[PDB]
C-alpha cells in the first residue's frame, strides 16, 4: 500500500508551530523521488542520510511533523540548534536522522491586515525535550502564545514558511 505524503505536503491548512502536527507514516510504500523532483523548496537539509539515495533505503517507521514559522526562524530547525522556536516550540534531538523541508508560503498564509491565526510560544519554565509538544495555555511567570501577524508586504525573513520534518526510524520502504 502507498504512503500518504500528499496529505502532508499539499495540506490546505498547517498548524501553528506550538501545536505542530505529527502523523505516523507506517506500513506502506513511498516514493520520495517525487520530492527531489521539486526545485521549489527553499530548504532541504538531511542529517545522516543523502537525499538522492533515499529510495534505496528502508526503515521501521517514518514520522512527518509540519508547522508554519517565519523564514528567518527555519534556522532553528536543525540538530542541537536553539533559539525561540527550538527552545519553546519544536526541538530536534542532537542525534537527529532525517530531512528538514521548507518553502515560502506567503500566498497561502499571509493576510492583508496581518494573519494572527499562526501562533508561537514565547517563554516556558524550561526548554522542550526532542519531539516534545506543548499546547499549554498557562500564563508564564517572570499568555504565552503570540501571533506572527504575517502580512503580504513583509520582508524576506518575516514571511511565513511551511516546514515538513521527516524523522527516520521494518514497515515502510521505497520502490517495490
Amino acid at each position: 500500500n502507498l504512503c500518504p505524503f500528499g496529505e502532508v505536503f499539499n495540506a490546505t491548512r498547517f498548524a501553528s508551530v506550538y501545536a505542530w502536527n505529527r502523523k505516523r507514516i507506517s506500513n506502506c510504500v513511498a516514493d520520495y523521488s517525487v520530492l527531489y523532483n521539486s526545485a521549489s523548496f527553499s530548504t532541504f537539509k538531511c542529517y545522516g542520510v543523502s537525499p538522492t539515495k533515499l529510495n534505496d533505503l528502508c526503515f521501521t517507521n517514518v514520522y512527518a511533523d509540519s508547522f508554519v514559522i517565519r523564514g528567518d526562524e527555519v534556522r532553528q530547525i536543525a540538530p542541537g540548534q536553539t533559539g525561540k522556536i527550538a527552545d519553546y516550540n519544536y526541538k530536534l534531538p542532537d542525534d537527529f536522522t532525517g530531512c528538514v523541508i521548507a518553502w515560502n508560503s506567503n500566498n497561502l498564509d499571509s493576510k492583508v491586515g496581518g494573519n494572527y491565526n499562526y501562533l508561537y510560544r514565547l517563554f516556558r519554565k524550561s526548554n522542550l525535550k526532542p519531539f516534545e509538544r506543548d499546547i499549554s495555555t498557562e500564563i508564564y511567570q517572570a499568555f504565552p502564545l503570540q501571533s506572527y501577524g504575517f502580512q503580504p508586504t513583509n520582508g524576506v525573513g518575516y514571511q511565513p514558511y511551511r516546514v515538513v520534518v521527516l524523522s527516520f526510524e521494518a514497515t515502510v520502504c521505497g520502490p517495490k
Partner: antibody
Amino acid sequence: QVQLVESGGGVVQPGRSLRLSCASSGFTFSTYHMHWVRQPPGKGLEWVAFISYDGSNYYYSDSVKGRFTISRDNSKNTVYLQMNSLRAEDTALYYCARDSSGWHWGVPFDYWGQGTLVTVSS
Amino acid sequence: IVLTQSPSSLSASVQDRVTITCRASQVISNYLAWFQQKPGKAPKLLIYAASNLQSGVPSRFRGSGSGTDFTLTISSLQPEDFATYYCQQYNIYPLTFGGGTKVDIKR
C-alpha cells in the same frame, strides 16, 4: 489544454466603471492564485492585483488600491476585476495570469491569457 | 521594491552571449522571475526562483543571483530570441516588474 481567456474590455469614459473577466480551462482552477497585470500602449508590464486560490488573500498595486476590486468564482472557473472610477492612465491591455507559488510544487506566472484591451477616453 | 533592469535596450548578433542585469532595492532572496515578450504576444515565463528553467525553455537561458543582484544570460543568441525581457519579484507585495530590455538586431 491550459487556457486563460480575458473578456470585457472596451472604450469607456473616465469616471465610469468596468468589470473584466478571465475564464480558465484545462487545469484545476481552484488551487491556483490569479493575477491581473496591465501593459499600457507602448510601455512595460505593470502588476495590478492578486487573489489567492481561496479568495481569502488578496492585494492591489498602489496605483489602483481603493478603485479596483478583485474577486473569483471557483465554481465557474473565472476571476474578475471590478474597475471603478476609471482614469485615462488605466488605458492598457489587461492580462490575466495563474500562479501556484506558495505550494511546495508551485510556479509563479507560468501562464498568461492574451489580454483584453481597456481604453479610457472622452 | 524597485527593480533596476539594465540595459534598457541592446543590439546583438546571432551566436552572441547576452547578459541582462536586475538589481532589487531590497533583498528578495531568490524570488525573481524572468519573462520574454514578443510584439502583439503575451509574456512567457523563462525562469522562476532566480535560476530554475521553466519546462520547454531552451538551456541557453540561464539565471543567476540571490539577495539583491540578479542576471539573465543567453549564452548563444538565436534568431527567435530577439525580443523584450522583463524581470519580476513575485513574493513581496506590492508585486514589481523591471523596466524591460529590448534586444534588437545589430547591423
